[PDB]
Design a protein around this nucleic acid. Structure first.
Lengths: 66, 88, 70, 259, 117, 104
RNA sequence: CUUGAGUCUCGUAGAGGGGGGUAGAAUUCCAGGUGUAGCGGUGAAAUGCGUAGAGAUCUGGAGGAAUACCGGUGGCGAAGGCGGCCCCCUGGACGAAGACUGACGCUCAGGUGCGAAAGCGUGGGGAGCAAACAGGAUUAGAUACCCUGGUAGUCCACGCCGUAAACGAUGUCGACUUGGAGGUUGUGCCCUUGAGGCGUGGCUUCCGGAGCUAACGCGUUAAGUCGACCGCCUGGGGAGUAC
């Protein structure tokens, strides 16, 4: 039950942080595709976006760090 | 890889119809231009073995093309290797 | 697994919530895996073997299920 | 000839997939299995509990017709998914009928708010509601005669999750699951959810728009470990459950049943 | 000594030994206790009971600081993880936060080699 | 030539300077006949984690169709400039001109 | 001549390669604060570190190496192998239609190149780990297993080495022969009336039919049915050794 297929997005945006926050953990972790049911193709790019965000301090790498 | 405009150009010069693109001579040329391009790269990047493998394959294929041309039509081969400056 | 005790929340409940959070994180398991070094081959072998076991458990037992025991 | 080809497409034309065409004639009853034949490859192993109405005794003898449901074929031998779900489509049609005249009129008797909203029951089934809908105003049926009879006037429905709240009184008055998963959240919102499969550590009650709950094994009852969920509740039944916990991230809403 | 109302408990939970350290909210340690120091040795100090009594000792130690509120940070894997915090609770502080504070590398340093037993 | 996607971050105390820098950047891009398709001053923003000890910082997004040489120049400027703490020049396939999800 | 082989057009996914940047966590060390008697380790110990203030805890700094989650009998690569982001240069693969060339092909002794880890050379680097080494245990002994330390090396640059259970223990290329359940990546149509429906390509995991097989098993990715070329085997040891 992938969201991206239904929406039909061409590419995930690291800027769209809210969308990302759905797929990250409370501890900051990227959520597996088993749990989210994201499509594989879409999962990879999602991870890529998350990491780009993390570099940009839009998302945190982890909950603890400061 | 080679840039589209450059492909189109080389095809135009060497191809008779300029729509052909598959003519043996045209092909040879395309390969030669690519080999020339990659020479600078590999001057820079000597350990880039994987890319060099491609380079070598392209060379070999060019080579086979030249041989085919030779047996088929000698003159045309001569003109091609004067144009490109291939020692053989 | 950062947690804050809610107003008028029991301690025991809070502890339970924390334990659950830790479990979710997989922190203890994470630690366990990093105690000493695993050879890449060993890691590969474990992963593969586990997958094989999973597949066996999924399919062969299903096949067995079709037939009744008594 | 093409007789048969024409018949094949005819018989396509005169059946559909879901439980829509009331076609299966009850051709054998014994307790505790009813069986039909809706022009399918095999006969359905029907429970008796899909077909007793509102007080616990059977209602249809041989020859009687109810459609069942489809789009799942042959777990190893057999044919169907059960017919009461078919009844759910009829209930949905009745609820939709409201739209036409902006008022669906039935009996609706809502004693108490399970998850903030009084529970309203239509003839056989009982559905759960959001708070406001039980009462048009702050009237609060707790002071009304218990299980009173008025109607249901729709206040709120979730439109993908079968949560429908209805207004018992006052005749005069007239991706997608996981972004905003804060509706049934706060600590303890109870729900009416059908269980799907009991995995010997769990029950997997999950009803509310494409989510997954687990009431796994620890609560379920007031005995801990010797319980074996299959013995203690059911298969395929709508129950008392509430959230107790939500992950919006690792999509593990961990419901409970000891409440 | 200056009295302080709110502070921290750091619980270093190892496989072999638990260490409880109460500190102020800034970082400055007030008191500490250990399972090994509580009179537990070898098999005995690597236990939840050892950990809880170490926690009790630490609590006793910082009585004169008159701490009321406390947030806890739990480090490491060990038995004295839940038991310790329970003991702390019993000792009679308002537990405010429970945090897990294990150092997880993001694949940094090579761990030592697997034991052959 | 090539459609780059730049996001650079300024030190919050230098927020008032931010426009001029942007202008400067823009000018360079125009110099080499480079187009500038979208430009969004995001403004002051809370960081997910404190980089270089500070907790807020000023985000600027920027979309450019420009030659690599000027892009390289811009990168060098950024690296030497102490105002900008971080940058992220990032290639893109198209000119994407429609703007960003949270500016919305 | 166009079926094989190749070129051109547009896309697609990718830990494919080379170069250069950068991020965060964690370990180590240094400097300083708080603080006080243990820490550490094991089956149990001891060596070891600690009142010259350790361990714990907080602040600041240095440096190296590797990239948690994603992550998958997932992907890419001729094989070896390849995993944080970014940029630069770069090789291949696949699909969609067309257009072109017109057998240009397959295989390959010698030959040439690439080729894990360890190892060598010169120059750098050196956090962690750790052959050697030292001590403590265990033991009859323990030149081991366990513990405490610990140097080559592991890291980088440029050379050499040319081997591994370098394995699918299965040479390469082509054709043909019942099926099912998946994964991944395209693509055509279809009311996408919805996560779908019907196809059609590439790569890929498992099961299994005929057939094959000493059996085990293989089974459209053959170990089946055939063709082309090459490599290799001829009892065990002596020996992949001597010259």
């Amino acid at each position: 039950f992938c969201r991206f297929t239904a929406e039909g997005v061409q590419e995930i945006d690291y800027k769209d942080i809210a969308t990302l926050k759905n797929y990250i953990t409370e501890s900051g972790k990227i959520v597996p595709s088993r749990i989210t049911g994201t499509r594989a193709k879409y999962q990879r790019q999602l991870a890529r976006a998350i990491k780009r965000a993390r570099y940009l301090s839009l998302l945190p790498y982890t909950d603890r760090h400061q | 890889s080679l840039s589209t405009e450059a492909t189109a150009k080389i095809v135009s010069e060497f191809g008779r119809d300029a729509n052909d693109t598959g003519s043996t001579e045209v092909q040879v040329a395309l390969l030669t231009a690519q080999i020339n391009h990659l020479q600078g790269h590999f001057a820079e990047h000597k350990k880039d073995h994987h890319s060099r493998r491609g380079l070598l394959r392209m060379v070999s294929q060019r080579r086979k093309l030249l041989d085919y041309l030779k047996r088929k039509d000698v003159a045309r081969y001569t003109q091609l290797i004067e144009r490109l400056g291939l020692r053989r | 697994p950062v947690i804050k005790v809610r107003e008028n929340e029991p301690f025991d409940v809070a502890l339970r919530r924390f334990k659950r959070s830790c479990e979710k994180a997989g922190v203890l398991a994470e630690v366990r895996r990093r105690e000493f070094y695993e050879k890449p081959t060993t890691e590969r072998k474990r992963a593969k073997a586990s997958a094989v076991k999973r597949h066996a458990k999924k399919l062969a037992r299903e096949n067995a299920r079709r037939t009744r025991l008594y | 000839e093409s007789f048969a080809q024409l018949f094949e497409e005819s018989l396509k034309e005169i059946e559909t997939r879901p439980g829509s065409i009331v076609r299966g004639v009850v051709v054998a009853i014994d307790k505790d299995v009813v069986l039909v034949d809706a022009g399918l490859k095999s006969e359905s192993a029907i429970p008796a509990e899909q077909f007793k109405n509102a007080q616990g005794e059977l209602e249809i003898q041989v020859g009687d017709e109810v459609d069942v449901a489809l789009d799942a074929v042959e777990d190893g031998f057999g044919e169907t998914l059960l017919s009461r779900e078919k009844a759910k489509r009829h209930e949905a049609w009745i609820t939709l009928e409201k739209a036409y005249e902006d008022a669906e009129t039935v009996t609706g008797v809502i004693n108490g708010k399970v998850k903030g909203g009084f529970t309203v029951e239509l003839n056989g089934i009982r559905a759960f509601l959001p708070g406001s809908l039980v009462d048009v105003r702050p009237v609060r049926d707790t002071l009304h005669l218990e299980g009173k009879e008025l109607e249901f006037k729709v206040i709120k429905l979730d439109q993908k999750r079968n949560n429908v709240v209805v207004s018992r009184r006052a005749v005069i008055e007239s991706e997608d699951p996981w972004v905003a998963i804060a509706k049934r959240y706060p600590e303890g919102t109870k729900l009416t959810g059908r269980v799907t499969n009991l995995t010997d550590y769990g029950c997997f009650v999950e009803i509310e728009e494409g989510v997954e709950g687990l009431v796994h094994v620890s609560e379920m009852d007031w005995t801990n470990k010797n319980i074996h969920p299959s013995k203690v509740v059911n298969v395929g039944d709508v129950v008392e459950v509430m959230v107790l916990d939500i992950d919006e991230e690792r999509r593990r809403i961990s419901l409970g049943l000891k409440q | 000594r200056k009295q302080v109302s709110d502070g921290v408990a750091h619980i270093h939970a190892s496989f072999n030994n638990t260490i409880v350290t109460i500190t102020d909210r800034q970082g400055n340690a007030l008191g500490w206790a250990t399972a090994g120091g509580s009179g537990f040795r070898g098999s005995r100090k690597s236990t939840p009971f050892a950990a809880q009594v170490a926690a009790e000792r630490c609590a006793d130690a910082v009585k004169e600081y008159g701490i009321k509120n406390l947030e806890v940070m739990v480090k490491g894997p060990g038995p004295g993880r839940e038991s310790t915090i329970r003991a702390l609770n019993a000792a009679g502080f308002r537990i405010t936060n429970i945090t897990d504070v294990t150092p997880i590398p993001h694949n940094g340093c090579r761990p030592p080699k697997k034991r052959r037993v | 030539m090539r459609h780059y996607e730049i996001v650079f971050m300024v030190h919050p105390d230098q927020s008032e300077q931010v426009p001029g820098m942007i202008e400067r950047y823009t000018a360079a891009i125009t110099g080499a006949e480079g187009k500038i398709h979208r430009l969004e001053d995001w403004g002051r923003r809370q960081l997910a984690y404190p980089i270089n000890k500070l907790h807020k910082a000023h985000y600027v997004l920027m979309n450019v169709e420009a030659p690599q040489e000027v892009i390289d120049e811009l990168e060098t400027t950024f690296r030497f400039n102490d105002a900008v703490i971080r940058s992220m020049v990032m290639r893109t396939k198209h000119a994407v001109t429609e703007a960003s999800p949270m500016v919305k």
